[PDB]
Every structure is written in C-alpha cells, then in structure tokens.
Design a protein around this nucleic acid. Structure first.
Lengths: 11, 397
RNA sequence: UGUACUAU
C-alpha cells in the first residue's frame, strides 16, 4: 500500500 | 553410438590420426566420451596435415560446421579448431578465415539464438582478425529478430560481445535500434534486455576505459550516447519504476562520468514525486542514488520537498517524513538523507560546490529533531535504531 | 526491514 500526500505549489 | 573399430571390449592407443583418417569424426564430436578425447587430442602436437584435416572436417564443411556448432559437446571442438586455424599462419590462413565468416554470416540469427552456437559466435567475434569480425556484425538482423536476440538468456551475450570488442562504427545501428522508443520499451522490460542496454551505455561513456579512442571515435561515441540518452530520459519514469530497468537509472544517476544526465533524470521523473517513488520496491533505490549523487543545488530542492513539499494528512497530521520513516521502502531513503547530512557535518562529504555547509546543518537539525521526538516509535524498528545510533556517533565526534 | 544480471 501507498500513503500519498497532496503537493504544495511552486509559485 | 561410436564406431566399433574404436570401441573397447574406446581403446587406449587411439590416436587422433586414426579418427581423422577414418572419416568418422562427426560421430566422435557429438558423443560425450568421443568429443572429450578430441578435445584433448587437438591440444597435442599436430603435423601440418593433421591441422589440414581438422580444418576441413570441423570448419570446412558448412553443414557439419553447423551441426557441430549447435551441439552440446561439438561446439567446444569448433572453438578449439577455430583457435588452431587462427594460430596457424600458413598459406591457407586467409582462405580459412574468409570461409569461416561466410559460414557464420549465412546463419547468423539461427546461430545467435542457439544455446551452443552463440558461444561459437562470441569466440569468433573476439578472436578473428578485426577486419573479418566486423563482417559478422553486418550479418546481424535488423527486424524483430534483433529484439529476440537481446532478450534471450544466451543470444544477448552476442550483442554484448559485439559491444565489447568491435568498434562503434560497425554496430551504431544497434544503438539506433535500441533507441527506438518501442524497441527500448520491450528490451528494457526484460531482464536480459536490460543487460544489453547497460553494456551499451557503459561502452558509450567517456570513462577511463575509453581514453584510448581517437577524437573522431570520441565524437561518434558522444553522438550515440546523446541519441540513446534522449530516448532513455523520455521513458525515465517507466524505467525508474521497472523491476529490471531501475538498475540502469541507478547507474546513470550514480556514474560520475554521466553526471550531466544526473540533473536530467531527477527533474524529469523524480522531482515532485519523491514521496510516491520512495514507497515503491524498485523506484526507492533510484531515489537513494539520486540523493547520494545529486548536485548541491538540486539536492536542496530534493530535501525541501521531503521536509516542506507535501501537505500533511488532514486527519492525522502525518507529513512526508512520518510516512517514509515507517514505510518498508521509504525508511531507506530517510536513512540515506541522514547519512548524507551526517557525512557533511563530519567532513566526510564536501559541502562546497556557495558553501552549502549551513544547508546540511538545517537538514540535519530537522532530522535530529524528528528522530528525537519519535525515538520511542523508532526504537521498535531496525531502521529507527540505525538512525538513532547514526546521530549518536556524531555527537561523540 | 527492500529488487536484476553474472548464460554450455
């Protein structure tokens, strides 16, 4: 199984 | 299955000339006991006529040469007789080597795919005169049969031998064939096909083993490396996560003489995917290699992605460090990050490429602070025990 | 606590 997290922005 | 005149109620005083004169050599060469005797017999003292008979009976008749080359025992005798022919500089030396190439060229693909005949191909590629060995490369197939050669457990070594002992100008078509995207996908999805690609990449690298090349040869080598590397980095994500091709991405990322392709690999498929790839069985090794050899400006972006690149879980508060530290594959990436930071502040790794020494202290302080707060949970695992002891030996020094 | 290849 994988535990994925939302990425932040790069601006 | 041996002729009865030689059988014993094989004799003891059976000479090689008895076998050569009898015309029954093909029977001995396919029998285990007989071919073992012929193996030792051709190593002794040979007269000019005895060599002449061996040259005609073993590598002089195409159909017999093919039958022996594809034989479990006979292929050893063919390699031995080929060696004797190459070592006999008499008036027939040129005619024999020319005929031997035609025998091999006329059945290149069938001999390559054969378990035993491919050994005869490899022996001829590295032992015949370079002018004659290049003619063998031209006989290689250019269609799907080349793929079948690259992914065969035995035939793949023929291409490897070509790469090792033949100048690049003769097999540059193999690079373009492998660089074809559909061919790269099929070849790099196979365990033996990856070995072919790995050997080609090593040969096309301007490392210590290629300083003997001329300028023209180096320029030809750099052109082939760029064409293959371009096709490799376009499938970078597929190869980095593949069960076999992940070793190739590790090599490109870790090899010093391929450092300009480090940046290409990391930004194309690793950046903004570190947390996901760190949790994969195969891609996690690539992430490890990337952290270890990345340039300092790119290493900072990688570290900042793990430390501050992801939004924590909205229910539990787990961040990327919390996930990787206790994942069965991600924990190795964190150990690698800690080892890198500990080596930098201890003088084992140069920090100076700006001076990123203060950058390594920030990352170490982050890792130390997290390991301190989670020491109880980490002490349950071997990975956490390593991390706690890694930080422990630093404080002593 | 975690992968290939090294083929008669």
């Amino acid at each position: 199984p994988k535990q994925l997290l939302q990425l932040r922005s790069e601006i | 299955v041996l002729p009865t005149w030689s059988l014993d109620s094989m004799r003891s005083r059976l000479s090689l000339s008895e076998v050569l004169d009898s015309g029954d050599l093909m029977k001995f060469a396919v029998d285990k006991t007989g071919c073992q005797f012929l193996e030792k017999a051709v190593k002794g003292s040979l007269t000019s006529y005895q060599k002449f008979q061996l040259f005609e009976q073993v590598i002089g008749r195409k159909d017999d040469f093919l039958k022996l080359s594809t034989n479990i025992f006979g292929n050893y005798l063919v390699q031995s007789v080929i060696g004797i022919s190459l070592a006999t500089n008499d008036d027939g030396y040129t005619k024999r080597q020319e005929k031997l190439k035609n025998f091999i060229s006329s059945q290149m693909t069938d001999m390559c795919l054969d378990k035993f005949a491919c050994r005869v191909i490899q022996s001829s590629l590295q032992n015949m005169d370079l002018s004659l060995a290049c003619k063998l490369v031209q006989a290689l197939p250019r269609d799907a049969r080349l793929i079948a050669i690259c992914v065969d457990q035995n035939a793949n070594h023929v291409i490897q031998k070509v790469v090792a002992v033949i100048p690049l100008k003769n097999w540059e078509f193999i690079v373009d064939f492998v660089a074809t995207p559909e061919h790269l996908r099929q070849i790099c999805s196979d365990k033996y096909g990856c070995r072919v690609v790995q050997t080609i990449i090593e040969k096309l690298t301007a490392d210590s083993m290629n300083v003997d090349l001329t300028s023209a040869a180096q320029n030809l080598r750099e052109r082939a490396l760029q064409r293959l590397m371009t096709s490799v980095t376009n499938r970078c994500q597929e190869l980095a996560t593949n069960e076999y091709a992940n070793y190739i991405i590790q090599h490109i990322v870790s090899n010093d003489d391929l450092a300009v392709y480090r940046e290409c690999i990391i930004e194309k498929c690793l950046m903004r995917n570190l947390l996901s790839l760190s949790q994969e069985k195969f891609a996690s090794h690539v992430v490890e290699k990337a952290f270890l050899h990345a340039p300092l400006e790119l290493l900072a972006e990688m570290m900042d992605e793990i430390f501050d690149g992801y939004i924590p879980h909205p229910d539990t508060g787990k961040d990327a460090l919390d996930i990787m530290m206790f994942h069965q594959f991600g924990n190795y990436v964190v150990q690698c990050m800690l080892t890198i930071c500990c080596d930098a502040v201890s003088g084992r790794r140069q920090t100076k490429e700006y001076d990123h020494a203060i950058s390594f202290q920030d990352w170490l302080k982050k890792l130390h602070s997290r390991v301190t707060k989670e020491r109880h949970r980490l002490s349950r695992f071997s990975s956490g025990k390593k991390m706690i002891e890694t930080l422990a030996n630093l404080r002593s020094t």
